[PDB]
């Protein structure tokens, strides 16, 4: 049970990392913003700073508070 569960967990983790890697390879190698003047992908690329900043914020929140509660309990 545990062996197969950890197996599939790490398999899914690597497959997700590969999905994101190829998602970046898309923007790097196969992209035509001429055809994409006005779609949702260009919009997503335009406010990228906001997405990155809010990811950073949620990460900071989780890390701060989790480590704080653990250190408090210790």
């Amino acid at each position: 049970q545990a062996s197969l569960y950890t197996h599939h967990q790490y398999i899914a983790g690597f497959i997700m990392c590969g999905a994101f890697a190829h998602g970046a390879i898309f923007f790097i190698r196969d992209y035509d913003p001429e055809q994409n003047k006005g779609n949702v992908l260009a919009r997503v690329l335009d406010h990228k700073e906001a997405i990155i900043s809010h990811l950073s914020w949620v990460s900071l929140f989780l890390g701060f508070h989790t480590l704080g509660l653990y250190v408090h309990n210790d």
């Binding site: 790097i28 190698r29 196969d30 992209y31 035509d32 913003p33 001429e34």
Partner: protein
């Protein structure tokens, strides 16, 4: 008149080191530098220690090209001395490189025509579309 390499040239007084002069220098290439050096003086070697240098034009040689550009730049630094470069291939053919203009590429010489350049603002290049060929690294104009 760009001067060409001349063998049988004396060398500065030095003991030895363990830098360069490997199998590459025998079967692939070796580079040569020549420069005036008046007022017999002390200098430093890029792949060794300190050495003396007689007055009158003297010639040196090393393994890598930068090992001589370093000496040319040094000579700029202290006293105005004007060395040159040389190339050597397996067939013995010699090629003169620095300075071809005679005026030290940092300064223009009367007139030439350069390559590997395009009149375009920074950026504003082509997207990966229509760049499937990719020709290694594209000149974007050829």
């Amino acid at each position: 008149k760009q001067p060409e390499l001349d063998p049988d040239t004396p060398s500065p007084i030095f003991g030895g080191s363990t830098g360069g002069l490997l199998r590459k220098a025998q079967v692939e290439e070796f580079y040569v530098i020549t420069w005036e050096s008046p007022k017999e003086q002390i200098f430093e070697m890029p792949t060794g220690g300190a050495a003396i240098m007689r007055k009158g034009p003297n010639l040196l040689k090393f393994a890598r090209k930068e090992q001589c550009m370093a000496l040319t730049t040094q000579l700029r630094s202290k006293f105005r001395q004007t060395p040159c470069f040389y190339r050597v291939y397996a067939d013995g053919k010699v090629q003169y490189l620095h300075p071809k203009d005679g005026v030290y590429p940092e300064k223009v010489n009367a007139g030439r025509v350069g390559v590997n350049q395009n009149m375009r603002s920074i950026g504003k290049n082509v997207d990966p579309i229509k760049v499937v060929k990719f020709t290694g690294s594209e000149p974007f104009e050829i």
